């Protein structure tokens, strides 16, 4: 129970429909490789779309990214408590949240339904989680690698994916076409014929 | 293997901020600044985890204060609009007499300020609609999803009306059953 947040401190200085805009972004990022085995933490600061200063756990301190962040690197790196904290984030924040989130993000599984039709055959796979998926086209038990073109992985925004993989077919009812999907939600390839 | 991102921003002079978490490109949750409440993207996540909402506002406050700081340091160099790339498709593949939802994807824009309407036959529709908050991109633009459940009919013709300062006029993405 109980999700964790990383904070920020003020940079160096002071405060405080066609009108010009100004945007500030902060991105606190946790990268996990092979579960929580190796983990990397980036405390990222943005003006408009530009990364001006960064804490990278693999470096151990703040470093200017552009000349804009130069004064923030010095400033923050002098708050020895701030650095101690950011250096713990890999464990107190990243590994923390991975553990709290694990069962319903990392371990979330939803079955793909793989329909097949034309409107060149569309084999369309919908509403699966997670994104990792393989979609193989088959021609009489032989994998057709050529004349296959695809939609890419499509992120629905609601924690489901969909992908359309179209195969070019010689327009005569010569033989059976098998579209076979593989996914971590399934224990055996889910195949789907058409002849 | 995995990425989790706490992504926030503050925007002048709209004075609007946002705080959310990203998992492999989906939103885990975001805090409703106005309502001071945590909104889980799927109802269930809140059964498994909690997040104390007022903390985000504290963050936003620092975001604000930095923005003010950066603005000056750049000599008030503002943001260059960057128009979106709409796209409309269907959740499941289409069928006649069978229910379905219409996803409108608004990609690669900035600042994160936009106006999305859903119409059918050139007339505004909003029954059952929904949207997500501005979401993060590795190039530091944003995405955003608007949702409209509906019913396959031959006669009906839908458009996702999308306006944004980088655009030079509103933007329509026609969609109809084929």
């Amino acid at each position: 129970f109980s999700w964790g947040a990383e904070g920020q401190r003020p940079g160096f200085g002071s405060g405080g429909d066609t009108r010009p805009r100004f945007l500030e972004q902060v991105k606190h990022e946790c990268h996990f490789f092979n579960g929580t085995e190796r983990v990397r933490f980036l405390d990222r600061y943005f003006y408009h779309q530009e990364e001006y200063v960064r804490f990278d756990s693999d470096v151990g301190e703040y470093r200017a990214v552009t000349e804009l962040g130069r004064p923030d690197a010095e400033y923050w790196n002098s708050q020895k408590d701030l650095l101690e904290q950011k250096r713990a984030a890999v464990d107190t924040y990243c590994r923390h949240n991975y553990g709290v989130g694990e069962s319903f993000t990392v371990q979330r599984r939803v079955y793909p339904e793989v329909t097949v039709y034309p409107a060149l055959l569309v084999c369309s796979v919908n509403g699966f989680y997670p994104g990792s998926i393989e979609v193989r086209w088959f021609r009489n038990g032989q994998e057709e690698k050529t004349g296959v073109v695809s939609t890419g992985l499509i992120q629905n925004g609601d924690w489901t994916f969909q992908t359309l993989v179209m195969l070019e077919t010689v327009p005569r009812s010569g033989e059976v076409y098998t579209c076979q999907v593989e996914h971590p939600s399934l224990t055996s390839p889910l195949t789907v014929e058409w002849r | 293997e995995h990425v989790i991102i706490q992504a926030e921003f503050y925007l002048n002079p709209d004075q609007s901020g946002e705080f959310m978490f990203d998992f492999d490109g989906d939103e885990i949750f975001h805090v409703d600044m106005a309502k001071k409440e945590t909104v889980w993207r799927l109802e269930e996540f809140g059964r498994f985890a909690s997040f104390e909402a007022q903390g985000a506002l504290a963050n936003i406050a620092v975001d604000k204060a930095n923005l003010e700081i950066m603005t000056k340091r750049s000599n008030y160099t503002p943001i260059t609009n960057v128009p979106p790339e709409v796209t409309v498709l269907t959740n499941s593949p289409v069928e006649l007499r069978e229910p379905n939802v219409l996803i409108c994807f608004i990609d690669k824009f900035t600042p994160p300020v936009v106006n999305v309407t859903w119409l059918r036959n050139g007339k505004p529709v909003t029954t059952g609609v929904s949207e997500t908050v501005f979401l993060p991109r590795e190039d530091h633009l944003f995405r955003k999803f608007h949702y409209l459940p509906f019913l396959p009919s031959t006669e009906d013709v839908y458009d996702c009306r999308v306006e944004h300062w980088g655009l030079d006029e509103p933007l329509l993405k026609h969609w109809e059953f084929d």
Epitope: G4, A5, P10, G15, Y93 | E52, G55
Partner: T-cell receptor, first 109, second 115 residues
Amino acid sequence: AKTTQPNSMESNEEEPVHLPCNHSTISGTDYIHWYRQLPSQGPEYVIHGLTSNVNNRMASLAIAEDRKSSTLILHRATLRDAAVYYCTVYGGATNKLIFGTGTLLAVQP
Amino acid sequence: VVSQHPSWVIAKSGTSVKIECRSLDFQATTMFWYRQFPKQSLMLMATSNEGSKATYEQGVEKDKFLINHASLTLSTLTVTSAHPEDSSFYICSARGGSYNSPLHFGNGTRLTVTE
């Protein structure tokens, strides 16, 4: 708020004192913090930690292996060490600092 | 460092008392307001995030106290309709950041109200 202390403790000067705190629901993203307050002043930071041991001049903090309790250790008590001692939690799950009822420590001359 | 002002305050009923909490040597993103009655503990009243409407803790009388946070260096508490029951110790703290940034306390303002 999420901590529990003995309301008061008695102790002799020149002896070390061990102030106990329970905090059995503390998140692994929050830290254990200790503050003390003299009779009419604001509270002041004494020490804080995450796990295991922490020490500074005159004062140490011993956190149990499971993080469900901790101890503030005063190595040698002076008469001026007599205060209210507050065990609090503060961190990544907890953005406000709430003081509980604390422990009222007397240092017998 | 953070300084409250004034340290000591005597006020007649129904007046209004103004306490200032200022962070001398840093930008305060959040100011907290605590008060403490005799024999009792510190209790949080309100949380102020710079350039925003303060949030009050439950059980806290909504209209009685007023925060004005406009500076990022200054926050101002105002007690309205001074009542003897508001004779208490009042403490503010400034935080230069959010999660895990240290609170810095004023040294308090001792308020007594007599009709």
